[PDB]
């Protein structure tokens, strides 16, 4: 039941938590970017630049 | 006393039922 | 004796009372406070050391895995004050904290530890304070004004008879802590002692005593 | 009786009762109630009296232990109850909440520490949650701690909080008085809406700790008090002020800082108490203050004496000469105003000061004070180099100190910050000496304004209520002229239709408009621009214009093409006319730098190399090359801009506002005034020597508001300028060193026993010449706040010069040359130009942008909006018979969407008539009530 409850809660957050709704795939991308930026913040010291995330992540920049 | 907080009312209405006993869920699934 | 910049143009001075204490450094109030906050002392009295010692020793509830604080340091600011003003940035210094994650062996109440992982971790940037008691936050020079607030403690502030007819004075007490909820004791015109918790209904005063594991006999013994 | 009324009988019953009170509706239970109660006061995590809290708690209960625990205890609560009962019946005094012994001081460090602790606890929650599942080698103490919460807390406190405000930077005095400001507002204090009068009122404990007169008049009066001159802060946070210990009868020189609660225990003498050169009071009975009140006491009864006569006022109020002669209201106004004086083109000096100017100027970091004594090796308008004396030289160093003066840069109030060297080549300077004068400073003396020859007389109603008449000579000399550097930013974002460009090719504008811009579309440096000229040429893509008919026809007729880019170039604001003194270009990393950006970048690099190279030449090489590469990287690294913005261009305009009617001028004694007329020189009143008066002030403004300080200052300034004129005359003819020395020495003695001693015998002939050259403009005079110059001394100084002792001369009307009867009072008064320039306040609007939800004009002068015709103005119109005026005011001029376009058209063809219609705001109200379950409609449609 935990799997399903977490799924429902997080999908609801993704679907009706913003005035300008954004899709689930884009919310996943944003969350991944946030998690990786947070990790690089401590692994680097000040901040990751958008180009710097093109390496940790695999997106065209 | 009395309250207007909906979450408090939900916690009151739901906390009445005992949580569960092991092999209780299996029996309930059997009934289903 | 006259300093050269004063020998150029001496201001004729009336006034007869000799100066015994010269005017102190006028910005001491801000510089001393921020110096205490930022500089680390080998005690928990002031600043980031005080905060870390107050909160940082971590215990994992029912896990007995601990994370503890060793020390901290302030990294060199990335940008200078003028550079921050030009580009527009907070003149801040990275805060590097030396942490140690200690893992306790299961069933080791004596304190036997499995391993210790001592690592230094970045915890945000705290804005620094220019030489003249100013902070630049987004390229704009900001000043934090000192606040004058009621001191923590106990105060007895009986009203002036403005509540009930006949101008009867109603006496009350109030415990104001730095952190936590308020504890107020007040009287009613019927001459009874009541406790009030902050933003809460009135209750008879003896309720708190009973909550403190006190019986009626010993309550009357005290009072 | 409380037990009688107590419904509870047992501990558990009381626990559940307090649980019901705290959390109604939640069914109480044993464990929950017990945990809540224990956590309320007796758990260190959620309750703590700071060391100051414990100290005050124990003191209030007369305990003898100054330390303790931060959490309550049964003994503490029962003792509080016992003392409450005692004060109810026995001997007990209600604690005075406004007592400064009961009010603490929170500074920046403490608040920052509290906010950092809040961040620490709210990341501690997360770290514990993650530790809920312990792991061995899959985790490090770098993944369990997140910097975002702590950074957010600290940034929220420092940037956006009530207790962190933009620095008032239009003055050294304003800066310093803002830094040492005590506020009762903010998170954890009162609110201006419901503060109450009792807290706002001044208290007998404010003596020597908080200024009684420096406070903003308005919604928050008595809540923004300012720290006194000598006031300090205890370890706990209670304001303490110095006092000089008094033995049996001798006023010792040792200083003790006494807190508010400690003051009452002793009786303290006044600063204005005479001493017979040996510490003994001349008068057996002296005036003191024991507990709030003051009275007379025997000589052998006092324990302390005021350190100085200045310690009751703040820094701002201590700069007002003859303050003791001014009514408290006018002194308050004068302080609040002189906080706002704008730095002028040439800061002259206060001809009549209080001796505090040096301290204010030096303490505020506006001047460059030599860190070490030595000989000035090289002076330049932009830098100073000091050859440190060998005595102060450290062994392993080169004794060279370089001070880099701050040239013309913008302040927070768009004023000019500019430092000028005040020393010459090869001059000796000792540690603590002022090298460069900052804005509104003269040789280390605070100089907020100018000293002007004023005369007190009506002069034809041109100074009627508070207006001021100014001579053209004031304008000609440009002595109230100010510089007003300001920023203008043009940002090119990335729009959906395409990126914006900063090309110089702008449609619908001729060659002349684009003459000032270079090939890259950005204005040159030094160009003299005017309101409407283009600074940065920017164009935004556009399309699908959907051209109307009878315009497509025009385009076809004249064969022109509709441009796909609309002009959005940054133009100088209307009215503003200045010179572009600096241009900065910030380019996003990925974007390609334009020609101008590269040209600026190269100039910065060469400047950086020159500065570093000059550093090494004057004076190590390893750090030079290491620093150069670091600086080179920073210059070309690429800027971190907001998302979407491609490139930011900032242009700095340097305006020069001279003077004009409507500009507010004010003295130091609360005497406001708005310039009304600028007179030709020949029209001003003049004396027997033909010297006109620079300003004419109404005398009727003095008696009503009891500020005689301005009159006394005028007399003293006249005397000072008399001495200065004598010195100037004796210099114009090369009299001698001896004559100048004798006269100057006589000037510094001046009768009454003044603590200052000046012996010109120790001054070299060259030094005396410099001194006299610096006095030919007038002899500066210091008049301490409450120990100022007595009127007899003013008369004596007037007599030193050949001026009349009455302080009044006979003037002649320049218009007619006929002597004014009743000789008038002329003298030199220190006038300031407050930052309320009429240029910044004039505003007019015919039509413009309209608000979004309510189709109404916008705010004031920033959105080019119209004035608010408030409810009271509507009442005023109703009281008149003006129905049509009112209707057009609230229907056509403001809100009727169809109405105002028709009114504009009708006016255009000279047909002054209106079709009122229905205001749009009423339609919004109807749709909003109908958005409830209410059916509101218009009958008989």
Curated annotation (Swiss-Prot), chain B:
Subcellular localization is given as: Cytoplasm
| Record text on subunit structure and interactions | Interacts transiently with the RNA polymerase catalytic core formed by RpoA, RpoB, RpoC and RpoZ (2 alpha, 1 beta, 1 beta' and 1 omega subunit) to form the RNA polymerase holoenzyme that can initiate transcription. Identified in a complex containing RpoD, the RNA polymerase subunits RpoA, RpoB and RpoZ, CRP and DNA. Interacts with Rsd; this prevents interaction with the RNA polymerase catalytic core and with promoter DNA, and as a consequence, promotes transcription from promoters that require alternative sigma factors. (Microbial infection) Interacts with Escherichia phage lambda antitermination protein Q.
* Similarity field: Belongs to the sigma-70 factor family. RpoD/SigA subfamily.
Main function: Sigma factors are initiation factors that promote the attachment of RNA polymerase to specific initiation sites and are then released. This sigma factor is the primary sigma factor during exponential growth. Preferentially transcribes genes associated with fast growth, such as ribosomal operons, other protein-synthesis related genes, rRNA- and tRNA-encoding genes and prfB.
Annotated domain remarks:
Contains 4 domains, connected by flexible linkers. In the active conformation, the domains are in an extended conformation, each making extensive interactions with the RNA polymerase catalytic core. In the autoinhibited state, sigma-70 factor domain-1 packs closely together with sigma-70 factor domains-2 and -4, contrary to the extended conformation that is seen when the protein is part of the RNA polymerase holoenzyme.
The molecule here is called RNA polymerase sigma factor RpoD
- Which organism does this record belong to? Escherichia coli (strain K12)
Phylogenetic classification of the source organism? Bacteria, Pseudomonadati, Pseudomonadota, Gammaproteobacteria, Enterobacterales
Which stretch of the full sequence is covered here? Answer: 92 to 123 of 613
From Swiss-Prot, chain C:
Q: Which domain of life is it from?
A: Bacteria
S-S pairs: none
> How this protein is processed and modified after translation, per its record?
Acetylated on several lysine residues in the presence of glucose.
Biotechnology (record note): Co-administration of salinamide and rifampicin or salinamide and myxopyronin suppresses the emergence of resistance to both antibiotics.
The record's comment on protein family reads: Belongs to the RNA polymerase beta chain family.
Biological role stated in the UniProt entry: DNA-dependent RNA polymerase (RNAP) catalyzes the transcription of DNA into RNA using the four ribonucleoside triphosphates as substrates.
Provide the assembly information.
The RNAP catalytic core consists of 2 alpha, 1 beta, 1 beta' and 1 omega subunit. When a sigma factor is associated with the core the holoenzyme is formed, which can initiate transcription. The rRNA transcription and antitermination complex (rrnTAC) consists of RNAP, NusA, NusB, NusE (rpsJ), NusG, SubB, ribosomal protein S4, DNA and precursor rRNA; S4 is more flexible than other subunits. In pull-down experiments interacts with CedA. (Microbial infection) Interacts (via flap domain) with Escherichia phage lambda antitermination protein Q; this interaction renders bacterial RNAP resistant to transcription pausing and allows it to read through termination signals.
Query: What is the protein name given in its UniProt record?
Result: DNA-directed RNA polymerase subunit beta
Per the UniProt record, the source organism is: Escherichia coli (strain K12)
Please indicate which part of the intact protein appears here, giving the first and last residue numbers and the full length.
Answer: 2 to 224 of 1342
Curated annotation (Swiss-Prot), chain D:
In which domain of life is the source organism classified? Answer: Bacteria
Industrial and biotechnological uses noted in the record: Co-administration of salinamide and rifampicin or salinamide and myxopyronin suppresses the emergence of resistance to both antibiotics.
Q: Which reaction does it catalyse?
A: RNA(n) + a ribonucleoside 5'-triphosphate = RNA(n+1) + diphosphate
Q: Which GO terms describe its cellular component?
A: cytoplasm; cytosol; cytosolic DNA-directed RNA polymerase complex; membrane; transcription elongation factor complex
User: What residue stretch is flagged as signal peptide?
Assistant: none
Question: GO MF terms on file?
Answer: DNA binding; DNA-directed RNA polymerase activity; ribonucleoside binding
Q: Which UniProt keywords apply?
A: Acetylation, Antibiotic resistance, DNA-directed RNA polymerase, Nucleotidyltransferase, Transcription, Transferase
Q: What is its EC number?
A: 2.7.7.6
User: Which residues are annotated as modified residue N6-acetyllysine in the UniProt record?
Assistant: 621, 799
Q: What is its EC class? A: transferase
UniProt PTM: Acetylated on several lysine residues in the presence of glucose.
Please provide the Gene Ontology terms (biological process) for this protein. bacterial-type flagellum assembly; bacterial-type flagellum-dependent cell motility; cell motility; cellular response to cell envelope stress; DNA-templated transcription initiation; intracellular iron ion homeostasis; nitrate assimilation; regulation of DNA-templated transcription elongation
- Tell whether Iron is among the UniProt keywords: no
Keyword Nuclease among record annotations: no
Question: So what does this one do?
Answer: DNA-dependent RNA polymerase (RNAP) catalyzes the transcription of DNA into RNA using the four ribonucleoside triphosphates as substrates. Resistance to the antibiotics salinamide A, salinamide B, rifampicin, streptolydigin, CBR703, myxopyronin, and lipiarmycin can result from mutations in this protein.
Q: Tell me the protein family, please.
A: Belongs to the RNA polymerase beta chain family.
Q: Can you name this protein?
A: DNA-directed RNA polymerase subunit beta
Q: Which organism is it from?
A: Escherichia coli (strain K12)
Which lineage is the organism of this entry classified under, starting from the top rank?
Answer: Bacteria, Pseudomonadati, Pseudomonadota, Gammaproteobacteria, Enterobacterales
Protein's gene = rpoB
**From the entire protein, which fragment is shown?**
349 to 1342 of 1342
């Amino acid at each position: 039941a935990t799997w399903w409850i977490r799924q429902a809660i997080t999908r609801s957050i993704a679907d009706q938590a913003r005035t300008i709704r954004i899709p689930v795939h884009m919310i996943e991308t944003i969350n991944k970017l946030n998690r990786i930026s947070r990790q690089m913040l401590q692994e680097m010291g000040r901040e990751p630049t958008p180009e710097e995330l093109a390496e940790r992540m695999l997106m065209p920049e | 006393g009395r309250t207007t907080d909906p979450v408090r009312m939900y916690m009151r209405e739901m906390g009445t039922v005992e949580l569960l006993t092991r092999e209780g869920e299996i029996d309930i699934a059997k009934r289903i | 004796v006259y300093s050269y910049t004063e020998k150029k143009r001496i201001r004729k001075d009336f006034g007869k009372r000799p100066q015994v204490l010269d005017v102190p450094y006028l910005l001491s109030i801000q510089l001393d406070s921020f110096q205490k906050f930022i500089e680390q002392d080998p005690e928990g009295q002031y600043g980031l050391e005080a905060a870390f010692r107050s909160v940082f020793p971590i215990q994992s509830y029912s896990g007995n895995s601990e994370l503890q604080y060793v020390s901290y340091r302030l990294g060199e600011p990335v940008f200078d004050v003028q550079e921050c003003q030009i580009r527009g940035v907070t003149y801040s210094a990275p805060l590097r904290v030396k942490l140690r994650l200690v893992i306790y062996e299961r069933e080791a109440p004596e304190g036997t530890v499995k391993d210790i992982k001592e690592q230094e971790v970045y915890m945000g940037e705290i804005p620094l304070m220019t030489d003249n008691g100013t902070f630049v936050i987004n390229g704009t020079e900001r000043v934090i004004v000192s606040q004058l607030h009621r001191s923590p403690g106990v105060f007895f502030d009986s009203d002036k008879g403005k509540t009930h007819s006949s101008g009867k004075v109603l006496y009350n007490a109030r415990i104001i802590p730095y952190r936590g909820s308020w504890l107020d004791f007040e009287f009613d015109p019927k001459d009874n002692l009541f406790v009030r918790i902050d933003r809460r209904r009135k209750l008879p005063a003896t309720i708190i005593l009973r909550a403190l594991n006190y019986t009626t006999e010993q309550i009357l013994d005290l009072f | 009786e409380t037990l009688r009324v107590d419904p509870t009988n047992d501990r558990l019953s009381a626990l559940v009762e307090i649980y019901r009170m705290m959390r109604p509706g939640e069914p109480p239970t044993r464990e929950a109630a017990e945990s809540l109660f224990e956590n309320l006061f007796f758990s260190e995590d959620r309750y703590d009296l700071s060391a100051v809290g414990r100290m005050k708690f124990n003191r209030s209960l007369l305990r003898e232990e100054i330390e303790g625990s931060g959490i309550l205890s049964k003994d503490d609560i029962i003792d509080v109850m016992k003392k409450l009962i005692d004060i109810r019946n026995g001997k007990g005094e209600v604690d005075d909440i406004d007592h400064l012994g009961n009010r603490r001081i929170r500074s920046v460090g403490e608040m920052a520490e509290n906010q950092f602790r809040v961040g620490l606890v709210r990341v501690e929650r997360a770290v514990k949650e993650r530790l809920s599942l312990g792991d061995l080698d899959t985790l490090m103490p770098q993944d369990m701690i997140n910097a975002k919460p702590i950074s957010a807390a600290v940034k929220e406190f420092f940037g956006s909080s009530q207790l962190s405000q933009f620095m008032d930077q239009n003055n050294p005095l304003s800066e310093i008085t803002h830094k040492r400001r005590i506020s009762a507002l903010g998170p954890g204090g009162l609110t201006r809406e419901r503060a109450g009068f009792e807290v706002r009122d001044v208290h007998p404990t404010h003596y020597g700790r908080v200024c009684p007169i420096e406070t903003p008049e308005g919604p928050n009066i008595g809540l923004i008090n300012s720290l006194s001159v000598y006031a300090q802060t205890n370890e706990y946070g209670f304001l303490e002020t110095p006092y000089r210990k008094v033995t049996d009868g001798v006023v010792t020189d040792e200083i003790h800082y006494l807190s508010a609660i400690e003051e009452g225990n002793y009786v303290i003498a006044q600063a204005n108490s005479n001493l017979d050169e040996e510490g003994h009071f001349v008068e057996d009975l002296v005036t003191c203050r024991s507990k709030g009140e003051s009275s007379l006491f025997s000589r052998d009864q006092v324990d302390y004496m005021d350190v100085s006569t200045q310690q009751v006022v703040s820094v701002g109020a201590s700069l007002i000469p003859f303050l003791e002669h001014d009514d408290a209201n006018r002194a308050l106004m004068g302080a609040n105003m002189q906080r706002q004086a704008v730095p002028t083109l040439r800061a002259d000096k206060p001809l009549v000061g209080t001796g505090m100017e040096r301290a204010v100027a030096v303490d505020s970091g506006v001047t460059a004070v030599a860190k070490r004594g030595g000989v000035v090796q090289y002076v330049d308008a932009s830098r100073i180099v000091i050859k440190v004396n060998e005595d102060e030289m450290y062994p392993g160093e080169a004794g060279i100190d370089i001070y880099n003066l701050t040239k013309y840069t913008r302040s927070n109030q768009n004023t000019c910050i500019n430092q000028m060297p005040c020393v010459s080549l090869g001059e000796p300077v000792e540690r603590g000496d002022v090298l460069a004068d900052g804005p509104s400073t003269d040789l280390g003396e605070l100089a907020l304004g100018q000293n002007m020859r004023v005369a007190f007389m009506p002069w034809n109603g041109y100074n009627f209520e508070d207006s001021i008449l100014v001579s053209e000579r004031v304008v000609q000399e440009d002595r109230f002229t100010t510089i007003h550097i300001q920023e203008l930013a043009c940002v090119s974002r990335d729009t959906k239709l395409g990126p914006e460009e900063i090309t110089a090719d702008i449609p619908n504008v001729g060659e002349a408009a684009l003459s000032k811009l270079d090939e890259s579309g950005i204005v040159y440096i030094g160009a003299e621009v005017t309101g409407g000229d283009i600074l940065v040429g920017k164009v935004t893509p556009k399309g699908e214009t959907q051209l109307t008919p009878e315009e497509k026809l025009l385009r076809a007729i004249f064969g022109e093409k509709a441009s796909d880019v609309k002009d959005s170039s940054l133009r100088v604001p209307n009215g503003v006319s200045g010179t572009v003194i600096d241009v900065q270009v910030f380019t996003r990393d990925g974007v390609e730098k334009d020609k101008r950006a590269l040209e600026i970048e190269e100039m910065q690099l060469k400047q950086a190399k020159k500065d570093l190279s000059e550093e090494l030449q004057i004076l190590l090489k390893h750090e030079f090359e290491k620093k150069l590469e670091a600086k080179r990287r920073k210059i070309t690294q690429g800027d971190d801009l907001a998302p979407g913005v491609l490139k930011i261009v900032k242009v700095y305009l340097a305006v020069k506002r001279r003077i004009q009617p409507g500009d507010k001028m004010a003295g130091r004694h609360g005497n406001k005034g708005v310039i009304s007329k600028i007179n030709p020189i020949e029209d001003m009143p003049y004396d027997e020597n033909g010297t006109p008066v620079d300003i004419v002030l109404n005398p009727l403004g003095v008696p009503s508001r009891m500020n005689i300080g301005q009159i006394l200052e005028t007399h003293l300034g006249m005397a000072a300028k008399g001495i200065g004129d004598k010195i100037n005359a004796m210099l114009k003819q090369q009299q001698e060193v001896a004559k100048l020395r004798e006269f100057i020495q006589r000037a510094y003695d001046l009768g009454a026993d003044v603590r200052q001693k000046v012996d010109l015998s120790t001054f070299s002939d060259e030094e005396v010449m410099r001194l006299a050259e610096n006095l030919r403009k007038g002899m500066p005079i210091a008049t301490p706040v409450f120990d100022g110059a007595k009127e007899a001394e003013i008369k004596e100084l007037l007599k030193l010069g050949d001026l009349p002792t009455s302080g009044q001369i006979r003037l002649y009307d320049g218009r007619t040359g006929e002597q004014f009867e009743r000789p008038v009072t002329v003298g030199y008064m220190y006038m300031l130009k407050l930052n309320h320039l009429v240029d910044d306040k004039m505003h007019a609007r015919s039509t413009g942008s309209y608000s979004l939800v309510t189709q109404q004009p916008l705010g004031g002068k920033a959105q080019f909006g119209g004035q608010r015709f408030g409810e009271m103005e509507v009442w005023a119109l109703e009281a008149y018979g003006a129905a049509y005026t009112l209707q057009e005011m609230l229907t056509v001029k403001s809100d009727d969407v169809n109405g105002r376009t028709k009114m504009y058209k009708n006016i255009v063809d000279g047909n002054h008539q209106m079709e009122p219609g229905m205001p749009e705001s009423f339609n919004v109200l109807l749709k909003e009530i109908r958005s409830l379950g209410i059916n509101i409609e218009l009958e008989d449609e």
